[PDB]
Each structure stands twice: as C-alpha cells, then as structure tokens.
Ligand binder design. Structure first.
Ligand SMILES: CC1=C(O)[C@@](O)([C@@H]2C[C@H]3OC(=O)[C@H](C)[C@@H]4CCC[C@@]5(CC[C@H](O5)[C@H](O)[C@@]5(C)CC(=O)[C@H](O5)[C@H]5C[C@]6(C)CC[C@](O5)(O6)[C@H]5CC[C@](C)(C[C@H](C)/C=C(C)/C=C/[C@H]3O2)O5)O4)OCC1
Ligand SMILES: Nc1ncnc2c1ncn2[C@@H]1O[C@H](COP(=O)(O)OP(=O)(O)OP(=O)(O)O)[C@@H](O)[C@H]1O
Ligand SMILES: C/C1=C/C(=O)O[C@@H]2C[C@@H](CC[C@H](C)/C=C\CC1)O[C@@](O)([C@@H]1CSC(=O)N1)C2
Ligand SMILES: [Ca+2]
Ligand SMILES: [Ca+2]
Length: 352
C-alpha cells in the first residue's frame, strides 16, 4: 500500500510498512508547461493546499501524479492508497479526493485518515490529545481509542508560514530588510535554525534588553551577517499569544485546554497525561516545557500532565499512516473500487 500525507507546505510519500517516507517535497506547482514539487523548486509558484484544505484540484492532481510516477515509481492502479486530511475538512473535499483517486488514478482501494490521529498512532497510543502544527494550519485533536472526537477539535489559522512572515516583519523592524519571496525562504531557514520557545517571555525579553547573551549570528546568502536576539523567541511566542500578529485566537495552550474541557470527564485525565506534539511547527526547542508550564496553570492542581514530543514529529503523520495501512486488521477498512462504483464519492462518509 502507498501512504501519501499532503500538507500545505510539504508532501510526505512512501510505502506502508516503511519507517520513514521515501520522498518529502514542496507542495507547489510552478508555471513559466507546468512543473511540480521538487522539479518546480529547481526552477510562478502556487500552493494547491491552503491551511490544510485542498483548494486547487487540477494542481492537486499534478501533485498526486508526480508522487506516484516520479517520487514512488508506481502505477496507482496497482496499489491501495492511504491519504491524509485535516481534522476538519469540508464534505465536498472528501468526496472530490475520493472521486479523483478512483476515477482519475484508478486506485483499487483507498482510505483517508485524519492527520493528527495518525500522529497519535506513531507515538504508540490510541488515546491522547494531539497538537498538530504545520506550515499552514494548527489543530488540537482529542482522540479516544483510535478515533478523533469531532465535537472537541480546535483549529487555529496560525502556523509555520505565518511565523516566518512575522520573523521577517520583526527583523525588518530591527533594521534589516526581509520582504521578498526569496527572502521568505531565507527567513524560514533562520527560523528553523535559531528560534526557540522561551520558558518565560518577559524574563527573556529582559535578558535580551540588557545583554547579548541570547544573540546568534547568521550569514545571509548575500554576504551580510545579521544578528538575531529576542527575535529568536518572539517569533514562536506567537503560538502562545496570537495577538502578536493581530489574531484573536486563544494560544495553543488555551486551545489544548479548551479541547480537553469539551470531552467527557472520564477521559480528560487520559488526555492531560498524553499530549502529543506533531508537525514541523512543534520543533522549536523549549516548546514541551512551555506547554507543560502553561497547561499546568490552567488545569486542576491535582491533574497529572505530560507533553510528549517525539523526535520524529516532522514525519509522525506519515509514520502513523505507514503503521495503520500495514495492520492486518485494517484490510477490511479500505474503500474498494466496487464500493465506489456502487455508492460514488459519498462512500467516503460511511467508511472513513
Ligand atoms: C469524519 C470527517 C469529518 O468530521 C469532517 O469532514 C468535518 C465535519 C464537518 O464539520 C463541520 O461542519 C463543523 C466545522 C464542525 C462539526 C462538529 C463540531 C465543530 C468542530 C469544531 C467546532 O464545532 C467549532 O468549529 C470550533 C469550536 C473549533 C474552533 O477552533 C472554532 O470553532 C473555530 C475557530 C476558527 C479559527 C474559525 C472557524 C474554525 O473553528 O476556525 C473552523 C471550523 C470550520 C472551519 C471554517 C474550517 C474548514 C475549512 C472546515 C470545515 C467547514 C469542515 C467541515 C466538516 O469537517 O474553521 O465543527 O472533517 C474530517 C473528517
Ligand atoms: N526546526 C524547526 N523549527 C521551527 N519550525 C520548523 C522546523 N522545521 C520545520 N519547521 C516548519 O514546519 C513547517 C512544515 O511542517 P509540516 O510538514 O508539519 O507542515 P505541512 O504538513 O506542510 O503543513 P500543514 O500541516 O499546516 O498543512 C514549515 O513552516 C517549517 O518552516
Ligand atoms: C526546504 C523546504 C522547506 C519547507 O518547509 O517548504 C515549504 C514549501 C515551500 C514552497 C516554496 C519553496 C521556494 C520550495 C522549497 C523549500 C522547501 O514554502 C514554504 O517554505 C513556505 C514559504 S516560507 C515558510 O515558512 N513556508 C514551506
Ligand atoms: Ca501536516
Ligand atoms: Ca490574545
């Protein structure tokens, strides 16, 4: 079976039963008659997925064909294919993915799983609450015995690309100039290399104000060496206080809490003890300790709280897919070509 995890920024693709994706490449299509993903990267670019939701279907077909043919070297008509989706995904989109897989790619079998749920599986759990934060969107997804609890899911627009754009803004306020699309990629690299989550925002602002102890240098492609100081932790602080970029949302600690509070009292303790971090935007050093501190301050004083931050969490959605698609007991769960022929795209609602 194939496993394809389509993100707003990065596609992760490979074979069920493997420990890691074979291909990780940008979720882009480029035109000057069109180039896809890593081919487009080597050369106007469009992202077919926005905030985790597929919005350009023709370009999404290009991404999928590139995945099957170029990245995995397979004919999709010969492999059951597991795909992933956002924890909240419009009904019409679920049908269109299904329609395309059966009618365009002629897959023999298909299934679509919620991204955050797969990450939980990759951590060795069937119960817990996942914070999955990527390039385009963030969700909190409470999960009991393998199944997301849809009424308790929380969503934030805020994710990694917004964090990059904010780092550009505050570095520009410092006296640099980061405004172009190329500069966006440079600042993404700065973010990934040098940013971290402060345990206490104010305390670290004070250290940065009165000393150079938190400063790091970065050699730009153009040869200027810049210095990054409080920007290192101000950038990801936005996750905890979205008002830094004018967003009204609760921060990720409060959305975690709010999600747990919408669940049955009998499972809340299990959720609090199994907070699993997923996605590239959870990679900041310090994030687990900060989450622990913030959730402790919101939760009952008696509550046992644990934040799990798997080292492999850039790829845990994919790994979870690999685990699920290669389970013997999953064999009966696939949507078959016959089922699709009889029920149409609407089959996805009954089976996934
Ligand atoms: C099995 C299967 C389905 O459950 C599902 O196909 C679900 C069921 C449908 O839910 C639905 O028709 C409903 C959405 C669904 C059904 C049951 C309960 C519920 C789930 C969560 C909750 O109410 C409510 O939206 C919350 C409290 C969560 C939240 O963060 C805020 O409101 C805010 C903030 C914000 C920043 C502003 C608004 C949003 O919520 O974002 C979310 C909520 C919806 C959306 C507009 C984003 C998109 C593009 C998704 C839509 C329209 C999804 C529709 C459906 O997805 O953004 O909504 O998803 C994938 C898997
Ligand atoms: N070490 C790091 N520190 C901070 N951010 C990082 C790090 N590594 C990757 N990221 C960010 O993670 C994001 C990519 O993560 P991921 O692959 O989980 O997202 P996606 O699946 O493409 O998007 P989404 O899930 O939002 O649709 C990018 O914004 C990237 O800059
Ligand atoms: C190395 C890498 C990282 C990434 O996450 O890439 C995804 C994919 C990408 C598409 C445009 C880019 C020119 C191509 C490849 C870069 C891929 O845009 C992102 O970099 C966007 C733009 S800045 C940011 O933080 N996210 C994230
Ligand atoms: Ca993702
Ligand atoms: Ca706020």
């Amino acid at each position: 079976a194939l496993v394809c995890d389509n993100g707003s920024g990065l596609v992760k693709a490979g074979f069920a039963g493997d420990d890691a994706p074979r291909a990780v490449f940008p979720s882009i299509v480029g035109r000057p008659d069109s180039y896809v993903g890593d081919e487009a990267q080597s050369k106007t670019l469009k992202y077919p997925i926005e905030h985790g939701i597929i919005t350009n279907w023709d370009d999404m077909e290009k991404i999928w064909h590139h995945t099957f043919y170029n990245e995995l070297r397979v004919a999709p008509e010969e492999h059951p294919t597991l795909l992933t989706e956002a924890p909240l995904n419009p009904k019409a989109n679920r049908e269109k993915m299904t329609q395309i897989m059966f009618e365009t790619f002629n897959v023999p079998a298909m299934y679509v799983a919620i991204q955050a749920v797969l990450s939980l599986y990759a951590s060795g759990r069937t119960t817990g609450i996942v914070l999955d934060s990527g390039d385009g969107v963030t969700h909190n997804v409470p999960i009991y015995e393998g199944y997301a609890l849809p009424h308790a899911i929380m969503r934030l627009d805020l994710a990694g690309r917004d964090l990059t754009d904010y780092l550009m803004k505050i570095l520009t306020e410092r006296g640099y100039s980061f405004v172009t699309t190329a500069e966006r990629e440079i600042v993404r690299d700065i973010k990934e290399k040098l940013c971290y989550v402060a345990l206490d925002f104010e305390n670290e602002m004070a250290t940065a104000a009165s000393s150079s102890s938190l400063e790091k240098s970065y050699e730009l492609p153009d040869g200027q060496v810049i210095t990054i100081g409080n920007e290192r932790f101000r950038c990801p602080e936005t996750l905890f206080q979205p008002s830094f970029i004018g967003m009204e949302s609760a921060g990720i600690h409060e959305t975690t809490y709010n999600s747990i509070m919408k669940c049955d009292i009998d499972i809340r303790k299990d959720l609090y003890a199994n907070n699993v971090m997923s996605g590239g935007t959870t990679m900041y050093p310090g994030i687990a300790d900060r989450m622990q501190k913030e959730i402790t301050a919101l939760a009952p004083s008696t509550m046992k709280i644990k934040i799990i931050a798997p080292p492999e969490r850039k790829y845990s959605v994919w790994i979870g897919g690999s685990i699920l698609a290669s389970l013997s007991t999953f064999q009966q769960m696939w949507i078959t070509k016959q089922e699709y022929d009889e029920a149409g795209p609407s089959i996805v609602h009954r089976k996934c």
